């Protein structure tokens, strides 16, 4: 689901919609949420809700609009999971970072904006959160269980604003040698923070996931809110 009428233009001209939640009280910092592989669906609506209840405005852009605008898939349906994997396999990561840059720029200047912008992403969006932190586009970035971060470690020195990553110790997208690489590489830059949740696997913060772990989702989420709070000005 997206908010009717909202349109954001990316550097190359492509336009895309977004699900927007204005804030209870304005002006407020705005958090751009980078979707998982299921598009802007029920979990994104819930994330927008969560952030608005904590005092932020939130913008979740339709990153699949270059392939299939308005895609919103149910992760409980087998056929739509297969569709999510097919879209993820074809996803242009650099164009997604470009679309997030445009959504971040939009987030800076809405009527309810206080000018500060954060980004929170999950899975596919957690890997995009790291690439966005390397570009420097946001004030703070947060990535939950981004996939393939051990292949992007040469960008660690480019991160110049804070970025927080929550990783599951039982997420098999990140086996032990990958964990160690990430832990050692991120460890060289104090602007990066990574926490490992030993009893949790991938998607552990989505309440509707079979891999949901309440204690870890809760510890992660509070660390995310404490990390984003300085943007409240």
Report on this structure:
With 233 residues, the chain is of the alpha/beta class. The longest helix is centred in the middle third of the chain and has 16 residues, at 93-108. It has one domain (1-233): Rossmann fold. The strands form two sheets. Strands 3-5-4-6-7-8-9 form a seven-stranded mixed β-sheet, sandwiched between helices. Strands 1-2 form a two-stranded antiparallel ribbon. It starts with 7 loop residues before the first strand and ends in a 5-residue tail after the last helix. Helices cover 34% and strands 20% of the residues. The protein contains six helices and nine strands, in the order ββββαβααβαββαβα.
N-end to C-end Cα span: 30 Å
CATH class: Alpha Beta
SSE order = EEEEHEHHEHEEHEH
Task: Report the total helices.
Answer: 6
CATH architecture label name: 3-Layer(aba) Sandwich
Q: Report the biggest beta sheet as strand number plus sense, adding barrel if it closes.
A: 7 strands, mixed
Strand order of the largest sheet: 3-5-4-6-7-8-9
- The CATH superfamily appears as Alpha/Beta hydrolase fold, catalytic domain
- Count of spatially separate domains: 1
Helix proportion range = 25-40%
Shape: globular
Q: How much is the radius of gyration in Å?
A: 16 Å
What is the third-level CATH name, the topology?
A: Rossmann fold
Approximate strand percentage: 15-25%
Beta strand count: 9
Helix- and strand-based class? alpha/beta
């Amino acid at each position: 689901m997206l908010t009717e009428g909202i349109s954001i233009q990316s550097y190359d001209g492509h336009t895309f919609g977004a699900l927007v939640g204005s804030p209870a009280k304005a002006p407020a910092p705005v958090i751009v949420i980078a979707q998982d592989i299921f598009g802007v669906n029920a979990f994104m609506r819930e994330t927008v809700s969560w952030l608005v209840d904590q005092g932020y405005a939130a913008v979740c852009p339709d990153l699949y609009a270059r392939q299939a605008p308005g895609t919103a898939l149910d992760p409980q349906d087998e056929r739509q999971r297969e569709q999510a994997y097919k879209l993820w396999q074809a996803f242009d990561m650099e164009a997604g970072v470009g679309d997030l840059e445009a959504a971040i720029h939009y987030a800076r200047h809405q009527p309810y904006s206080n000018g500060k912008v954060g980004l929170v992403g999950y899975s596919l969006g957690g890997a995009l959160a790291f690439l966005v932190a390397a570009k420097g586009y946001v004030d703070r970035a947060v990535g939950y269980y981004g996939v393939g971060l051990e292949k992007q470690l040469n960008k660690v020195p480019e991160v110049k604003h804070p970025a927080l990553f929550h990783m599951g110790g039982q997420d098999h997208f990140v086996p032990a040698p990958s964990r160690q690489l990430i832990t050692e590489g991120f460890g060289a830059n104090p602007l990066l923070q990574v926490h490992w949740y030993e009893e949790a696997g991938h998607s552990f913060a989505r309440t509707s996931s079979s891999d949901y772990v309440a204690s870890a989702a809760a510890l992660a989420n509070e660390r995310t809110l404490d990390f984003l709070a300085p943007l409240q000005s």
